[PDB]
Symmetry: D2
Subunit: 384 residues, 4 copies
C-alpha cells in the first residue's frame, strides 16, 4: 500500500543518517565559480539558496509527488500560498477563471478581491452540474478551479466530467483536495492538471504546522509554479518540512481511522432527533454520493450538520468536554466550528446565500480518538 512508499522515500542518506536532516540554512557553498554558475543555469546537481531549493523541503515534495502521481511538487508556507501560486502563476490580465461557488473563505477572498484587481475575470458557479460549467464558458476561459467535497458544505463536483471539458477546450483544471487527502482523492488520475492541499490539515495532521503543497501533471507546469514561488516567496520552512514529512509517515493509517470514525459519527448525528440534516459525502442520503463513491477511494472526516436554531448550535458547541471549539480540520483530535461567524464570516452576503451557509450550521472535524468516546461527548452535550 501507500504506507511502505511513504516510509521508504527515494534518495540517498545524508551522512548515513536514518532520519533525514533538517537543513536549517539559507545558503550553500560552491566548489568553484563554474560549478556555482552551472547551477544557476540549471546544469549539474546541487543547491544554491533555500528559496530556490532546500534538501529537507525537497524530500517532503518528493513524498507528496509520489502519492499524487505527478511530474513534480512544490511546498509552500500555507495552503493559501499553494492556491495563489497554482492560479496566478498562469492567469493574467484578460483571462477568465471559472471557480466553484462554494469554497474555503480565504479562497473566496483571493478570487473575489485580488484577482479582479489584476484584470482577471472570475465567475463562481455550481460545479456539481457540468452543463452549468459549459454555459459559463467564454473564449478567454483559461482555468477551472474546484474544491470537492467543498468546505464547509461538502458539495461534490464531477471532477472527471469537468476535466473532459477542460481538455477539449484548452483550459487548466486545478483541484484543492485538502478535505480528502491524497490517500482518497488523486485529481491528476481524474484528468486534473494540478492537485493541491493545505498541508496544515490531514497531510501533517498533528495541528502544529501551516503549509501548502501543489502538484502538477507536467514538468513544465511545476517549473512555472516554482518560478512564481521564487518571486512570490511563500516557502515552507525546513523545520515545518521535517515536521510535515514526519506527520506524513502515519498518513495512510490516520486516514483509515478518520474515514471510519467520520462515517460513524455522521450516522449517529443523522438519526438523532435534535439534528435536522447531515452533510457527509459517504451517506446514501447525501446528493452527490454516487459521484463521490465513483471518483474517490474514501472520505475525509470533516463534515457539516444542521441544528434547529442558533441557540441550540451554541448550546452544543459550548458544552462539549472532548471536542475543542476551534477553526481548522484534519487534526488527530476532534475539532468543531461555526462557519457563519468564523471560517466563512467574511464571505459576501450573496456568496453566503448561494453557498447555503446559515447560523444553524455546525462543522465538525472528527479525529482518531475512540469513536464511542466522541459519540458520548456529543450525546451529553445534545441531551443536556
Amino acid at each position: 500500500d501507500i504506507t511502505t512508499t511513504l516510509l521508504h522515500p527515494k534518495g540517498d542518506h545524508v551522512l548515513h543518517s536514518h532520519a533525514y536532516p533538517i537543513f536549517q540554512t539559507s545558503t550553500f557553498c560552491f566548489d568553484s565559480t563554474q560549478q556555482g554558475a552551472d547551477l544557476f543555469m540549471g546544469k549539474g546537481e546541487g543547491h544554491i539558496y533555500s528559496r530556490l531549493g532546500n534538501p529537507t523541503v525537497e524530500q517532503f515534495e518528493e513524498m507528496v509527488c509520489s502519492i499524487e502521481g505527478a511530474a513534480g511538487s512544490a511546498a509552500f508556507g500555507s495552503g493559501m500560498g499553494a492556491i495563489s501560486s497554482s492560479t496566478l502563476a498562469f492567469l493574467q490580465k484578460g483571462d477568465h477563471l471559472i471557480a466553484g461557488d462554494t469554497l474555503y473563505g480565504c479562497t473566496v477572498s483571493l478570487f473575489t478581491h485580488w484577482l479582479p484587481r489584476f484584470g482577471i475575470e472570475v465567475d463562481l458557479i455550481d460545479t456539481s452540474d457540468v452543463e452549468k460549467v459549459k454555459a459559463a464558458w467564454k473564449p478567454n476561459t483559461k482555468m477551472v478551479y474546484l474544491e470537492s467535497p467543498a468546505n464547509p458544505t461538502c458539495k461534490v463536483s464531477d471532477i472527471k466530467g469537468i476535466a473532459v471539458v477542460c481538455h477539449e477546450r484548452g483550459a487548466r483544471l486545478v483541484v484543492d483536495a485538502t478535505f480528502t487527502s491524497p490517500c482518497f482523492l488523486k485529481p491528476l488520475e481524474l484528468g486534473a492538471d494540478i492537485a493541491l492541499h493545505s498541508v496544515s490539515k490531514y497531510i501533517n495532521g498533528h495541528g502544529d504546522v501551516i503549509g501548502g503543497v501543489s502538484s502538477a501533471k507536467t514538468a513544465e507546469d511545476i517549473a512555472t509554479i516554482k518560478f512564481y514561488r521564487k518571486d512570490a516567496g511563500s516557502l515552507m520552512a525546513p523545520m515545518d518540512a521535517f515536521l510535515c514529512a514526519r506527520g506524513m509517515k502515519t498518513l495512510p493509517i490516520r486516514m483509515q481511522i478518520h474515514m471510519e470514525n467520520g462515517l460513524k459519527v455522521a450516522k449517529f448525528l443523522e438519526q438523532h432527533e435534535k439534528i435536522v440534516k447531515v452533510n457527509h459525502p459517504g451517506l446514501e442520503s447525501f446528493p452527490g454520493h454516487d459521484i463521490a463513491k465513483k471518483q474517490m477511494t474514501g472520505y475525509g472526516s470533516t463534515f457539516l450538520f444542521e441544528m434547529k436554531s442558533f441557540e441550540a448550535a451554541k448550546k452544543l458547541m459550548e458544552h462539549l468536554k472532548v471536542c475543542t471549539l476551534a477553526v481548522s480540520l484534519g487534526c488527530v483530535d476532534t475539532l468543531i466550528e461555526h462557519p457563519a461567524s468564523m471560517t466563512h464570516a467574511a464571505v459576501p452576503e450573496n456568496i453566503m446565500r448561494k453557498q447555503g451557509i446559515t447560523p444553524e450550521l455546525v462543522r465538525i472535524s472528527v479525529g482518531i480518538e475512540n469513536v464511542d468516546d466522541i459519540i458520548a461527548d456529543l450525546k451529553q452535550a445534545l441531551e443536556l
Copy 2:
C-alpha cells in the same frame, strides 16, 4: 532616550508562563472560550488568537521588535524577502496603475517587476533613481508607487530617498524602500519620508545564515493592515521556529552591525589601494559617487559591496583561493561571503537591464562578516598575490 541595544533586548509584551525566552508557538490553531469570543476575534473585537496564518504569538513578537526599530505603525513578517516585496507592492498596485522602480535591484526583484507585474496589468518603468529629475520625468498621471533599494544590490548605487519622498508626497504616490543592505540600525526609511520600509531578514537582521524570511513595516496603521490582508491570501508566512531564530539573531544586531560597518570600511580601503583592484564601490568611500547623499541619509553602512578586478580570470582566481571568505550567494552573515554577480545573483537579469546596472564579468561582490578584520585582509592579500 533608551538605546536601541536595550530596546531589542527588552521588547514590549507580557511574558508567557513567566518564561524568560519567548516560547515557540508551533501550532496551527487556537481554542475559543465560547462561540461569541471566537466570533468577536473574527471581527477584530478583543485580544487573542485564531489561526497562525492570521497571527502567531512568536511571529508577532518578532514583528514588534522590528516595528520598534523602524519607528513604524506595525510590521508584518513573511517567509522570505521576496514575500515582503510582493506583499508591499501588489497589496496596493492594481491594473492600470504605474510603478517607478530603481534600475539596479536584486535580481529576483527585477524578475517580479518585469515578468509578473505586467501580467497583472501593472505598468512598470525601471529608472535611474540616483537622479530625482529622471524620476520626475518618468512620472505619469497614474503613477501610484516608487520602489527604491539604496545602496542597490550589487553596485551600491545610492538614491536620494528624501528628495524622491517629497515628490511622492506631493503627487499621491507611496514610497517603498528595501533597506536590506544597510539594516534598520543604519537606515530608517520611515524617518526619511518613505511609507514602507522592508528587509530580507535572511541577511543582517537574522545575521546567522540559517533562516530565509522577510519583514515589511508601514508608517500608517491602514497600510500595515492592508499588507497583512494581502499576506493572509497570498500565504507567505514566517514559520514560528524561524521567528524564534530571527528574534534571537536580532538580539545582537546592533553590535554585529557596528563590527560589520567597521570591518567593511577597512577591507574596502585595503582593496582600494591594492594594485590588482581597479575600483571599489563602497558608499562610505570618499571616491564613491553618492557618498555625500549616503552619509547624510544614513547613520552607518552595511558591509556588502562590490569591487572590479582587471579581468574575469583574475576575479575567478581570487574567489577560488580564499580560505576565510566563503564562495556562496547571500550576505549579511556573521562570516564573510563572496560571489560573482554576472554569473550568480544577477545572471538571470535581462541583458539590457544588466548593462544599465553596469554589471560585468570583472566584478566581485563581498559581504564582510565579523571575523577579525586583519585575518580577512590577510586572506584577500594572499590570494591577490598568488603565483
Copy 3:
C-alpha cells in the same frame, strides 16, 4: 471508561495563550514576580517555574502523558534511556547495597551494572530472572533492588514480573522494570507490582527514529521526588524540542503499537516455517518458552524479536541483501530495522556473561515497522533465495 487513544489526545492541564498544540518552551530560566514568590518556589510552594533543569512546561506535559498511561504517582523524562536507567537505580542504591539484575539486558545496561555500580561500592549479581526460585536463591541481607527487562533485549526472554514483585514486596526491595520492548500500551509494570517502570523513549513511545530520550515512572510520590532530585544533580534532561517531538509521536502510539504487534506476529510466523530458519524467539508464539507468562502479564507484544540462521555467512547474506529493511541499530521505529547483536548492540558485553545470555554470531534481530506486512515478507523472501 475513556479509552487510551482519547486520553493521550486530550491530556490534562491549561492551554497556553489558547494554543491548541502545546508551545515549545525553549528557555533556560523563568522570571519572578517578587523576591518572596521566587523564594517560595525554591521552597516548593505554590505553583510555577524557576529553571528548566528543575522543570520545563513542555517536558512536564510529556511526563504527564506517560504518567497517565503507566498509572503512576509521577513521571520523569531524561536525555536518554540510559539516563532513566541510571537515575532509577543510583537514585536509591548506595555503597554496601546489593542489586539483582536479569542476566540478559541491553548491552549498555550491562556496562552500567558491570563497570560503574561496583566502582561506587554496589554489589551486582546477574541472574536468570525467568525462574523466581533463582531470584530467591540469589537474595542477600543487603539486597535493596531487583532490575528486570521482559521480554529481554535481544533474545526476548520473559520473566515472571508478578511473582518477582511479590518477593520484592515480601523482602523490602524495589522492583524496577525496563518495558522499552513492549511499550506502555501492552506492558504496565506498575499494575504488576513493580515500583518503577521505565522506557527508552527513543524506541516506540516516540516511534519516529528522530529522538533519543528516556522516561521513568514511580508508584509513590516520594520515589519520583527522589528520582527528580537525582536528575537535578546528575543532569540527564530531555530538551524542550525533544519533549515536543515525543509528545507528538505519542499521539499515535496506540494505533502504531496495534500495527507493530500484528505486523510482527505475521513476520515471525513466516520465519518460523521457512526452511532456512532454525528458530524464532517471539514471545507471542505458542512454541516460545514463557509464552504462557507473557500472555497473562501483557495485553500485547512489541514488534522486535530475534531468529537463528544456519551460519554467520547466511546471517551476513540475509542482512546485506534486503531492499526494504535497513541495516541499523535501535528499534521501534515506523520502518523496519535489522541488526546483528553479537558484533553490534552487544559487542561490548563480556564473553562470560554473553555466553550465558545465549547470544551467538548466528543470531539476527529484526524490528518490524508499520509498513504493509506483505512488502516486508517479500523483502525477506527475496533475500532468502540468493
Copy 4:
C-alpha cells in the same frame, strides 16, 4: 596567529551537502553499508556514526568549536552543566578515593558533592582553595582530584589555579576547573595546568537564555574518552537542536564577552561609589581580595558579581523596582539578570556551608548583559534612589 573570533566562525570539518550552516541531525540511529562496516564502527574503525547517544554530527560540531578555544585534546557536550560536572568527576572517582573541592560552589554542585558522592564511597572535603596551604593541609594519600570554581558562584572568590595545579601535578591528582563564570574567552584552565575545563553552556557560551547544556574538555585523549564512556552510560546528552543553538550562540561569544566584561566593570564601579552599597565583589576591582591573582591568570572578566546592601529590606526594594534588569536565576544572558542568592540559587545549601561561603540576606547577585551600560546604570540608580 588567527583570532579566536575567526576560528569560531570557521570551524574545521567537511560541509554537508554544501550547506553553509551545519545541518541539524534530528536522528536517533544511522544506517550501515554492510555487516563489516557496522561491526567495525563498534570497534571502532574508522570514520562514521552509529547512534546519537554515542555521537551525533551536529553535537560533534559544537564539541570541536569548544575544543578549539580551550586548547584541549577533545570536548564532550552534555544535557546540562550538572551533566558535565557529574561526568567529569564520577568518570574518575571511585569508592575509597578522596576529592578536595572549593568551599564556595554553585549550590547544585554542593548538592552533588555532599549528598551523592559520599553515598558512592567517595570522601569529600570542601576547602578554602584561595589558600594553597589549606589545600596542601587537606591532602591525603588517597587524594585523586581537586575541583575548583574560580571566581566562585556567587561571591567571586578567587582561587590560585596555577599554584594548586603544581600540587596536583606533583602528587598525581587531576585538577578539574568549572570556568562557567568567566567563559573560555577569558579563562583557559588547560593553559594554567588544569586537566579538565568545563562549563555550563547555559550561561555565556550559548548566551541567549534559551538552552540548558554542559561541556567538558580534557587535556588528554585518554581522559576525554573516559568522560565519553561515562556519558554513554549516564546518558546526559546534548540534543541535536540544542547543539545547533549553542553553536549558533557561540558564533558571537568573543564580541558578547568583550561587551559583558566592560559593562560589568562599569556597573561595579558605579555600585562601589554608591552610598546605598556597602561592598562590591567583582574580581576586576582593585579593592577585591585576589584581584592580583585574577589579573594574572585570566585575560578578562565575566559580568556576574555580587554586592552588599545595608539590609535585606533594601535588597528586596532594589530587586523589585528594576525595569531593565529581570528578577530570575541564571546568568550569562544577553540581557541583565538579578537574583537573591540566600533565598534562591543557594537556598538549599546547608547552613554550615552557607556561612563559610559568606552568603547573607543583604547580598544581591547581578549578571550584567549587553544592553547599553548607561541604561543599566540609570535603571539601578532610579531604584536605589526610591522614596
